[PDB]
GROMACS .gro file of C-alpha atoms in nm:
model
  345
    1UNK     CA    1   5.916   8.820   4.050
    2UNK     CA    2   6.208   8.698   4.254
    3UNK     CA    3   6.517   8.907   4.196
    4UNK     CA    4   6.769   8.707   3.989
    5UNK     CA    5   7.119   8.668   4.129
    6UNK     CA    6   7.417   8.859   3.989
    7UNK     CA    7   7.651   8.622   3.800
    8UNK     CA    8   8.020   8.688   3.736
    9UNK     CA    9   8.074   8.525   3.395
   10UNK     CA   10   8.041   8.589   3.021
   11UNK     CA   11   7.714   8.396   2.988
   12UNK     CA   12   7.488   8.178   3.201
   13UNK     CA   13   7.149   8.015   3.219
   14UNK     CA   14   6.939   7.836   3.481
   15UNK     CA   15   6.665   7.603   3.354
   16UNK     CA   16   6.412   7.367   3.507
   17UNK     CA   17   6.448   7.017   3.362
   18UNK     CA   18   6.082   6.921   3.376
   19UNK     CA   19   5.920   7.248   3.260
   20UNK     CA   20   6.200   7.388   3.044
   21UNK     CA   21   6.145   7.719   3.222
   22UNK     CA   22   6.444   7.959   3.217
   23UNK     CA   23   6.470   8.096   3.571
   24UNK     CA   24   6.773   8.322   3.515
   25UNK     CA   25   6.997   8.408   3.223
   26UNK     CA   26   7.263   8.646   3.095
   27UNK     CA   27   7.383   8.659   2.734
   28UNK     CA   28   7.234   8.313   2.694
   29UNK     CA   29   7.245   8.325   2.314
   30UNK     CA   30   7.594   8.456   2.264
   31UNK     CA   31   7.803   8.223   2.048
   32UNK     CA   32   8.105   8.111   2.249
   33UNK     CA   33   8.361   7.828   2.236
   34UNK     CA   34   8.219   7.518   2.406
   35UNK     CA   35   8.559   7.346   2.428
   36UNK     CA   36   8.521   7.023   2.625
   37UNK     CA   37   8.147   7.076   2.675
   38UNK     CA   38   8.144   6.945   2.321
   39UNK     CA   39   8.189   6.605   2.484
   40UNK     CA   40   7.832   6.619   2.614
   41UNK     CA   41   7.720   6.577   2.253
   42UNK     CA   42   7.986   6.310   2.192
   43UNK     CA   43   7.833   6.116   2.479
   44UNK     CA   44   7.479   6.183   2.353
   45UNK     CA   45   7.569   6.014   2.024
   46UNK     CA   46   7.751   5.721   2.192
   47UNK     CA   47   7.450   5.695   2.425
   48UNK     CA   48   7.212   5.667   2.129
   49UNK     CA   49   7.424   5.397   1.967
   50UNK     CA   50   7.419   5.194   2.293
   51UNK     CA   51   7.046   5.245   2.341
   52UNK     CA   52   6.982   5.135   1.983
   53UNK     CA   53   7.203   4.826   2.043
   54UNK     CA   54   7.428   4.911   1.750
   55UNK     CA   55   7.722   4.889   1.990
   56UNK     CA   56   7.763   4.713   2.327
   57UNK     CA   57   7.953   4.809   2.646
   58UNK     CA   58   8.160   4.489   2.624
   59UNK     CA   59   8.256   4.532   2.255
   60UNK     CA   60   8.631   4.566   2.207
   61UNK     CA   61   8.751   4.852   2.000
   62UNK     CA   62   9.081   4.864   1.811
   63UNK     CA   63   9.253   5.200   1.857
   64UNK     CA   64   9.369   5.357   1.528
   65UNK     CA   65   9.668   5.583   1.458
   66UNK     CA   66   9.432   5.878   1.474
   67UNK     CA   67   9.385   5.821   1.846
   68UNK     CA   68   9.737   5.887   1.964
   69UNK     CA   69   9.940   6.210   1.983
   70UNK     CA   70  10.219   6.061   1.771
   71UNK     CA   71   9.970   5.981   1.494
   72UNK     CA   72   9.754   6.291   1.545
   73UNK     CA   73   9.940   6.608   1.643
   74UNK     CA   74   9.605   6.762   1.743
   75UNK     CA   75   9.613   6.559   2.066
   76UNK     CA   76   9.945   6.696   2.195
   77UNK     CA   77   9.901   6.866   2.531
   78UNK     CA   78   9.534   6.770   2.577
   79UNK     CA   79   9.364   6.533   2.822
   80UNK     CA   80   9.415   6.173   2.708
   81UNK     CA   81   9.382   5.813   2.834
   82UNK     CA   82   9.716   5.739   2.661
   83UNK     CA   83   9.593   5.493   2.399
   84UNK     CA   84   9.827   5.339   2.140
   85UNK     CA   85   9.758   5.210   1.789
   86UNK     CA   86   9.652   4.845   1.802
   87UNK     CA   87   9.535   4.865   2.166
   88UNK     CA   88   9.207   4.681   2.236
   89UNK     CA   89   8.978   4.877   2.471
   90UNK     CA   90   8.619   4.826   2.598
   91UNK     CA   91   8.343   5.056   2.471
   92UNK     CA   92   8.267   5.083   2.842
   93UNK     CA   93   8.624   5.196   2.917
   94UNK     CA   94   8.646   5.443   2.631
   95UNK     CA   95   8.301   5.574   2.728
   96UNK     CA   96   8.419   5.643   3.086
   97UNK     CA   97   8.733   5.806   2.940
   98UNK     CA   98   8.516   6.052   2.744
   99UNK     CA   99   8.272   6.115   3.026
  100UNK     CA  100   8.472   6.106   3.355
  101UNK     CA  101   8.820   6.194   3.228
  102UNK     CA  102   8.734   6.394   2.912
  103UNK     CA  103   8.995   6.192   2.721
  104UNK     CA  104   9.030   6.335   2.371
  105UNK     CA  105   9.179   6.011   2.235
  106UNK     CA  106   8.884   5.810   2.373
  107UNK     CA  107   8.659   6.046   2.178
  108UNK     CA  108   8.834   5.963   1.850
  109UNK     CA  109   8.858   5.589   1.913
  110UNK     CA  110   8.483   5.571   1.991
  111UNK     CA  111   8.387   5.804   1.705
  112UNK     CA  112   8.556   5.572   1.454
  113UNK     CA  113   8.399   5.269   1.614
  114UNK     CA  114   8.046   5.417   1.611
  115UNK     CA  115   8.047   5.600   1.276
  116UNK     CA  116   8.357   5.468   1.089
  117UNK     CA  117   8.527   5.806   1.095
  118UNK     CA  118   8.542   6.140   1.274
  119UNK     CA  119   8.371   6.330   0.991
  120UNK     CA  120   8.075   6.091   0.986
  121UNK     CA  121   8.048   6.112   1.368
  122UNK     CA  122   8.054   6.491   1.360
  123UNK     CA  123   7.769   6.460   1.110
  124UNK     CA  124   7.564   6.269   1.367
  125UNK     CA  125   7.659   6.537   1.622
  126UNK     CA  126   7.523   6.816   1.402
  127UNK     CA  127   7.224   6.606   1.302
  128UNK     CA  128   7.116   6.573   1.664
  129UNK     CA  129   7.201   6.936   1.726
  130UNK     CA  130   6.945   7.029   1.460
  131UNK     CA  131   6.695   6.776   1.587
  132UNK     CA  132   6.713   6.906   1.947
  133UNK     CA  133   6.678   7.271   1.845
  134UNK     CA  134   7.033   7.380   1.910
  135UNK     CA  135   6.986   7.669   1.668
  136UNK     CA  136   7.312   7.840   1.759
  137UNK     CA  137   7.535   7.533   1.782
  138UNK     CA  138   7.780   7.385   1.531
  139UNK     CA  139   8.027   7.108   1.613
  140UNK     CA  140   8.348   7.073   1.408
  141UNK     CA  141   8.535   6.803   1.608
  142UNK     CA  142   8.446   6.495   1.815
  143UNK     CA  143   8.629   6.616   2.125
  144UNK     CA  144   8.584   6.992   2.133
  145UNK     CA  145   8.946   7.086   2.068
  146UNK     CA  146   8.994   7.422   1.894
  147UNK     CA  147   8.854   7.435   1.542
  148UNK     CA  148   8.757   7.728   1.316
  149UNK     CA  149   8.375   7.735   1.308
  150UNK     CA  150   8.278   7.558   1.631
  151UNK     CA  151   8.038   7.732   1.871
  152UNK     CA  152   7.748   7.691   2.112
  153UNK     CA  153   7.556   7.906   2.360
  154UNK     CA  154   7.453   7.878   2.727
  155UNK     CA  155   7.096   7.818   2.614
  156UNK     CA  156   7.192   7.546   2.367
  157UNK     CA  157   7.414   7.374   2.626
  158UNK     CA  158   7.119   7.362   2.871
  159UNK     CA  159   6.891   7.218   2.600
  160UNK     CA  160   7.153   6.956   2.517
  161UNK     CA  161   7.207   6.875   2.883
  162UNK     CA  162   6.834   6.828   2.929
  163UNK     CA  163   6.826   6.596   2.630
  164UNK     CA  164   7.115   6.382   2.758
  165UNK     CA  165   6.939   6.337   3.091
  166UNK     CA  166   6.600   6.263   2.934
  167UNK     CA  167   6.693   6.064   2.621
  168UNK     CA  168   6.998   5.851   2.721
  169UNK     CA  169   6.977   5.829   3.098
  170UNK     CA  170   7.219   5.534   3.122
  171UNK     CA  171   7.484   5.760   2.966
  172UNK     CA  172   7.387   6.048   3.193
  173UNK     CA  173   7.432   5.815   3.493
  174UNK     CA  174   7.806   5.785   3.422
  175UNK     CA  175   7.863   6.163   3.457
  176UNK     CA  176   7.831   6.150   3.837
  177UNK     CA  177   8.112   5.898   3.873
  178UNK     CA  178   8.395   6.057   4.072
  179UNK     CA  179   8.663   5.822   3.935
  180UNK     CA  180   8.738   5.528   3.717
  181UNK     CA  181   9.041   5.307   3.691
  182UNK     CA  182   9.221   5.246   3.360
  183UNK     CA  183   9.562   5.078   3.319
  184UNK     CA  184   9.570   5.042   3.697
  185UNK     CA  185   9.555   5.419   3.752
  186UNK     CA  186   9.255   5.597   3.897
  187UNK     CA  187   9.134   5.893   3.688
  188UNK     CA  188   8.936   6.170   3.864
  189UNK     CA  189   8.622   6.353   3.751
  190UNK     CA  190   8.717   6.723   3.737
  191UNK     CA  191   8.358   6.822   3.818
  192UNK     CA  192   8.429   6.951   4.170
  193UNK     CA  193   8.056   7.008   4.239
  194UNK     CA  194   8.015   6.629   4.261
  195UNK     CA  195   8.173   6.677   4.605
  196UNK     CA  196   7.949   6.972   4.718
  197UNK     CA  197   7.776   6.923   5.054
  198UNK     CA  198   7.536   7.210   4.980
  199UNK     CA  199   7.381   7.047   4.667
  200UNK     CA  200   7.305   6.704   4.521
  201UNK     CA  201   7.491   6.759   4.192
  202UNK     CA  202   7.515   6.472   3.945
  203UNK     CA  203   7.660   6.616   3.624
  204UNK     CA  204   7.770   6.719   3.381
  205UNK     CA  205   8.082   6.862   3.224
  206UNK     CA  206   8.365   7.111   3.273
  207UNK     CA  207   8.553   7.292   2.999
  208UNK     CA  208   8.815   7.561   2.952
  209UNK     CA  209   8.837   7.755   2.626
  210UNK     CA  210   9.143   7.911   2.457
  211UNK     CA  211   9.111   8.243   2.639
  212UNK     CA  212   8.751   8.317   2.735
  213UNK     CA  213   8.774   8.117   3.056
  214UNK     CA  214   8.607   7.839   3.245
  215UNK     CA  215   8.281   7.664   3.152
  216UNK     CA  216   8.049   7.432   3.346
  217UNK     CA  217   7.726   7.255   3.267
  218UNK     CA  218   7.587   7.132   3.597
  219UNK     CA  219   7.273   6.952   3.698
  220UNK     CA  220   7.133   6.898   4.048
  221UNK     CA  221   6.828   6.760   4.223
  222UNK     CA  222   6.636   6.856   4.532
  223UNK     CA  223   6.324   6.664   4.624
  224UNK     CA  224   6.126   6.613   4.305
  225UNK     CA  225   6.295   6.901   4.126
  226UNK     CA  226   6.590   6.905   3.880
  227UNK     CA  227   6.775   7.218   3.759
  228UNK     CA  228   7.041   7.261   3.492
  229UNK     CA  229   7.284   7.550   3.503
  230UNK     CA  230   7.537   7.660   3.250
  231UNK     CA  231   7.810   7.910   3.323
  232UNK     CA  232   8.032   8.000   3.030
  233UNK     CA  233   8.353   8.204   3.037
  234UNK     CA  234   8.417   8.260   3.409
  235UNK     CA  235   8.760   8.411   3.486
  236UNK     CA  236   8.875   8.146   3.734
  237UNK     CA  237   8.813   7.781   3.823
  238UNK     CA  238   8.683   7.886   4.164
  239UNK     CA  239   8.427   8.131   4.019
  240UNK     CA  240   8.316   7.874   3.762
  241UNK     CA  241   8.208   7.638   4.043
  242UNK     CA  242   8.097   7.907   4.283
  243UNK     CA  243   7.861   8.094   4.043
  244UNK     CA  244   7.720   7.760   3.931
  245UNK     CA  245   7.654   7.670   4.296
  246UNK     CA  246   7.494   8.011   4.357
  247UNK     CA  247   7.245   7.964   4.066
  248UNK     CA  248   7.138   7.609   4.146
  249UNK     CA  249   7.100   7.707   4.513
  250UNK     CA  250   6.884   8.010   4.431
  251UNK     CA  251   6.657   7.816   4.194
  252UNK     CA  252   6.583   7.544   4.448
  253UNK     CA  253   6.534   7.786   4.739
  254UNK     CA  254   6.275   8.013   4.573
  255UNK     CA  255   6.097   7.805   4.307
  256UNK     CA  256   5.899   7.484   4.278
  257UNK     CA  257   5.793   7.272   3.981
  258UNK     CA  258   5.433   7.155   3.958
  259UNK     CA  259   5.247   6.951   3.697
  260UNK     CA  260   4.882   7.063   3.665
  261UNK     CA  261   4.840   6.869   3.336
  262UNK     CA  262   4.994   6.524   3.352
  263UNK     CA  263   5.116   6.344   3.039
  264UNK     CA  264   4.814   6.135   2.931
  265UNK     CA  265   4.571   6.364   3.108
  266UNK     CA  266   4.288   6.520   2.910
  267UNK     CA  267   4.278   6.900   2.959
  268UNK     CA  268   3.978   6.966   2.726
  269UNK     CA  269   3.747   6.754   2.512
  270UNK     CA  270   3.646   6.888   2.175
  271UNK     CA  271   3.394   6.794   1.910
  272UNK     CA  272   3.554   6.669   1.595
  273UNK     CA  273   3.382   6.694   1.256
  274UNK     CA  274   3.357   6.428   0.993
  275UNK     CA  275   3.564   6.171   1.181
  276UNK     CA  276   3.527   5.816   1.306
  277UNK     CA  277   3.487   5.948   1.663
  278UNK     CA  278   3.263   6.244   1.749
  279UNK     CA  279   3.507   6.401   1.996
  280UNK     CA  280   3.879   6.405   2.075
  281UNK     CA  281   4.079   6.442   2.398
  282UNK     CA  282   4.325   6.731   2.400
  283UNK     CA  283   4.610   6.763   2.646
  284UNK     CA  284   4.961   6.891   2.714
  285UNK     CA  285   5.149   6.568   2.648
  286UNK     CA  286   5.482   6.585   2.829
  287UNK     CA  287   5.500   6.965   2.846
  288UNK     CA  288   5.243   7.026   3.122
  289UNK     CA  289   5.489   7.114   3.399
  290UNK     CA  290   5.542   7.473   3.510
  291UNK     CA  291   5.798   7.640   3.740
  292UNK     CA  292   5.646   7.891   3.986
  293UNK     CA  293   5.762   8.086   4.293
  294UNK     CA  294   5.715   7.864   4.601
  295UNK     CA  295   5.368   7.867   4.761
  296UNK     CA  296   5.194   7.999   4.446
  297UNK     CA  297   5.020   7.679   4.342
  298UNK     CA  298   4.688   7.788   4.493
  299UNK     CA  299   4.698   8.092   4.266
  300UNK     CA  300   4.765   7.907   3.941
  301UNK     CA  301   4.510   7.807   3.675
  302UNK     CA  302   4.532   7.705   3.307
  303UNK     CA  303   4.399   7.824   2.969
  304UNK     CA  304   4.398   7.766   2.593
  305UNK     CA  305   4.325   7.906   2.253
  306UNK     CA  306   4.166   7.664   2.015
  307UNK     CA  307   4.317   7.787   1.685
  308UNK     CA  308   4.096   7.673   1.399
  309UNK     CA  309   3.765   7.725   1.583
  310UNK     CA  310   3.661   7.393   1.439
  311UNK     CA  311   3.828   7.057   1.455
  312UNK     CA  312   3.794   6.842   1.148
  313UNK     CA  313   3.920   6.491   1.087
  314UNK     CA  314   4.172   6.350   1.025
  315UNK     CA  315   4.347   6.436   1.353
  316UNK     CA  316   4.677   6.272   1.448
  317UNK     CA  317   4.802   6.192   1.799
  318UNK     CA  318   5.047   6.461   1.899
  319UNK     CA  319   4.925   6.690   1.627
  320UNK     CA  320   4.928   7.038   1.771
  321UNK     CA  321   4.597   7.215   1.737
  322UNK     CA  322   4.643   7.513   1.961
  323UNK     CA  323   4.803   7.656   2.267
  324UNK     CA  324   4.805   7.616   2.643
  325UNK     CA  325   4.889   7.927   2.842
  326UNK     CA  326   4.950   7.926   3.218
  327UNK     CA  327   4.827   8.195   3.459
  328UNK     CA  328   4.935   8.318   3.805
  329UNK     CA  329   4.689   8.513   4.019
  330UNK     CA  330   5.337   8.311   3.266
  331UNK     CA  331   5.419   8.012   3.040
  332UNK     CA  332   5.288   7.864   2.710
  333UNK     CA  333   5.287   7.517   2.554
  334UNK     CA  334   5.120   7.337   2.263
  335UNK     CA  335   4.769   7.203   2.314
  336UNK     CA  336   4.788   6.868   2.151
  337UNK     CA  337   4.555   6.595   2.024
  338UNK     CA  338   4.594   6.296   2.247
  339UNK     CA  339   4.448   6.028   2.019
  340UNK     CA  340   4.414   5.969   1.643
  341UNK     CA  341   4.082   6.035   1.468
  342UNK     CA  342   4.062   5.925   1.108
  343UNK     CA  343   3.818   6.057   0.847
  344UNK     CA  344   3.473   5.897   0.861
  345UNK     CA  345   3.378   5.637   0.598
   0.00000   0.00000   0.00000
């Protein structure tokens, strides 16, 4: 134990990026409006399109009537880049508008360009939500503006944030930019923690609901460690940033992340029956990191249950065949086959 800090907000979570370990939490599964935090997913999808080379940063996109308050009353009063039908705008520019400025028109213009329409793009958003395990998340819009059945949770927001960092790091990289210039005007990042002197914060997104309050998904680094915090429904802007600071600060001060089983390390070797190899290497894959109170490494040692007491071919790389459990004078992860073994012939 380390006593968890008190947090003045509707819901929050603090999570280690490498281990996935939840260090502190309150109401972390309560369905709440994500508002502009929705744009983390928007960026995830745009990120995937860029990484797959289905779109390029230099591609010019033609802005439709849907991307303009005049032509889409839903945009009235919201953050926008001020795009007009027929404008030609860089993917790179519209991408910065989504990420740095949270421009709701940039969201629409890029959704159409990527997926041909908003509804198709929202389909990709929910598809990835299901893929990434966001069991309590449903997106109904590409920008996060108020819609009937649209919700997420602190926990799901931290999972999504971890995915953005891990899966599309070039897109994550843009979220630390303090400004960008469009139409000769500089546009500020409203993530005030990018300016903190007390932390090295590099993301991710701010949001304000209809009337629950002020939301932040933040990520920071210290030495080799990275934490993600989510604070949902704080009463003020100040508290939103301050409680987020307090969590990240506490996690780095008292905990450390260690990796006793590296990816590609063998943890145990096991006999395999009836295969083209007589034994198979079993490991943790990428999930061998654990978050522990500082100084406790000495006192930590690892274990597993073999499920099926008896391994029989065929075995497939990554196939999970049991369970690693971590022990402090604590955490559990699949024990996985690290190489394929076909049936003998």
